[PDB]
Amino acid sequence: PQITLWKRPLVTIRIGGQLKEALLDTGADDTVLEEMNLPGKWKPKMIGGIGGFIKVRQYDQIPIEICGHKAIGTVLVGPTPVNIIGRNLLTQIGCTLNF
Amino acid sequence: PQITLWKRPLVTIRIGGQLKEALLDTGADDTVLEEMNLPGKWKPKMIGGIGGFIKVRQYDQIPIEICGHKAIGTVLVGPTPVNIIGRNLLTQIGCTLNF
Numbered sequence: 001p002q003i004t005l006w007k008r009p010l011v012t013i014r015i016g017g018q019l020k021e022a023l024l025d026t027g028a029d030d031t032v033l034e035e036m037n038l039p040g041k042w043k044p045k046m047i048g049g050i051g052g053f054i055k056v057r058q059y060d061q062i063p064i065e066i067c068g069h070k071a072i073g074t075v076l077v078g079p080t081p082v083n084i085i086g087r088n089l090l091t092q093i094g095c096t097l098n099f
Numbered sequence: 100p101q102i103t104l105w106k107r108p109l110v111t112i113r114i115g116g117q118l119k120e121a122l123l124d125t126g127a128d129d130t131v132l133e134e135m136n137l138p139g140k141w142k143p144k145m146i147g148g149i150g151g152f153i154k155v156r157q158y159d160q161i162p163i164e165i166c167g168h169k170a171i172g173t174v175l176v177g178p179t180p181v182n183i184i185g186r187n188l189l190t191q192i193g194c195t196l197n198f
């Protein structure tokens with residue numbers, strides 16, 4: 001689809017059979033989701049943001065269906081203020097900016 | 100133009116006699132610029148992201164050129180590591196997300 005920006009670009013994602021809303025976030029390098037359980041091994045990681053740095057859990061090769069488009073990649077889980085889909089998965093679903 | 104997301108969506112912006120690089124950021128409600136001493140009235144504000152909140156100065160009706168497209172609107176000035184062009188101005192230059 002084409003998504004305009006007068007409203008937040010929130011979309012439904014499917015991850016582990018669960019439906020969540022996430023923000024399509026071109027200013028985010030990485031996909032970061034709020035606290036949740038995911039299966040498999042994870043690695044402790046730290047990431048920075050506008051307010052400072054946080055600890056997250058890094059899960060690799062996680063399938064997410066984002067607004068009907070399939071991705072498989074890295075998902076960071078931690079105290080993000082909102083679920084964000086970053087460029088690592090935006091590229092997988094073929095998302096571009098146009099003006 | 101079309102901007103892919105393999106790398107950060109940085110573009111050249113102009114605010115007065117200052118040329119800067121800034122993210123076209125669909126995940127930002129508002130435009131947030133690095134510390135700069137703009138003329139005119141402002142109001143204090145807090146904005147929150149990954150890691151917590153920062154204190155910013157809200158200036159209204161500031162003209163800004165984004166990739167040679169004219170915009171004018173609210174700009175938040177504060178201790179951000181990166182200049183962020185948020186949705187309030189992305190809409191003014193005709194910016195959409197497409198996939």
Ligand SMILES: COc1ccc(S(=O)(=O)N(CC(C)C)C[C@@H](O)[C@H](Cc2ccccc2)NC(=O)[C@@H]2CN(c3cccc(C(F)(F)F)c3)C(=O)O2)cc1
Pocket residue numbers: 023025026027028029030047048049050051052081082084124126127128129130131146147148149180181183185
């Ligand atoms: C009301 O208006 C607002 C409110 C919040 C923001 S936001 O910047 O926090 N953020 C909101 C989002 C988390 C829901 C927008 C994100 O797109 C944000 C932009 C940003 C990029 C880089 C630094 C700071 C902010 N992105 C991120 O939070 C992460 C942080 N980040 C990153 C990567 C490497 C290093 C660093 C750091 F600078 F912290 F070292 C940050 C990155 O790629 O995406 C902007 C406008």
